[PDB]
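Operator note (shift B, R.M.): manual run for endothiapepsin requested after the automated queue skipped it. Running by hand, logging everything below so the morning shift can see what happened. Input copied straight from the record, untouched. If output looks odd, do not overwrite the archive copy; leave it for review.
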Amino acid sequence: STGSATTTPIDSLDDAYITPVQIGTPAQTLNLDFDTGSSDLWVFSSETTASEVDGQTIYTPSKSTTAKLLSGATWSISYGDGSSSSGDVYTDTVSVGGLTVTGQAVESAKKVSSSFTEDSTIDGLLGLAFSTLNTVSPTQQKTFFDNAKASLDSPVFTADLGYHAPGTYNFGFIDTTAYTGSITYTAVSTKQGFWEWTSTGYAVGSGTFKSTSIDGIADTGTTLLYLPATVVSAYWAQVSGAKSSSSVGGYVFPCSATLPSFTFGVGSARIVIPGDYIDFGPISTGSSSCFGGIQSSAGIGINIFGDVALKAAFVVFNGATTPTLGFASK
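Run finished. Output pasted below as returned.
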């Protein structure tokens, strides 16, 4: 089997991407944030605290003939931006882009933190990291990809995120029309439950490439590119007026700037992030100070190849017995 679904930016900055997911019988379609950095599929629901729902589409398990309470199971998760959610668990039929999993754990939110409430366009998350990170207790549950894997034509999914435009998540096949040149594959460590890999270095603009190992995670659920302070300083030093602002919470730059590109290494291959992808616009409405898309990972504890990096590439998440990651230009 295979699946293919379009993923759409939630706003003009590509702050996140949503992908329609069919849950239950008859189908209830919710727009979920596919997140290769976590492993829980959770949704706004009929059980969510009413004051914490503001415009989201909810899953109502009582209206699904295939929903079953997973007795005794609870979940609770916290994300890297400080947001969180928790609740109980159903199993139900879940389909993405024509690919169907029966008995998928659908984690129903009883509580969500303020930033989720405020994100009216995100109806939940669909985790695509390794199932060892799934938070369901006392019986850990498998991700959608883990459940679908055996049935897929090939045990892979791909992320093809658009810049200020829709893109595609495919399951079970590699669309050889969706990228240019060849796919370069690179080793993955699953020791921390992430799609963790090591970039071979970087360049700023038209500058020379610096060969240096940068361990980090391919994370579709994180907006920006978070890299070591040395790398980030070298980038922003090429933008007149750019500075790190403690009050804003990262590097800002004059909105009048033309940003240089940023290149990262994948083995001997190179992915180029155009400067425009690094612009996240005014820090507040009407400001001439703009927020940067490359930020320091210092104090996160891990480097994160988020959407800013991933949207510059066609990315293969290869879930073979020994997982790997592939990157191609597009």
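Quick read of the result: The two ends are 25 Å apart (CA to CA). The chain has two domains: 5-174, 175-330.
Leaving this for review. - R.M.
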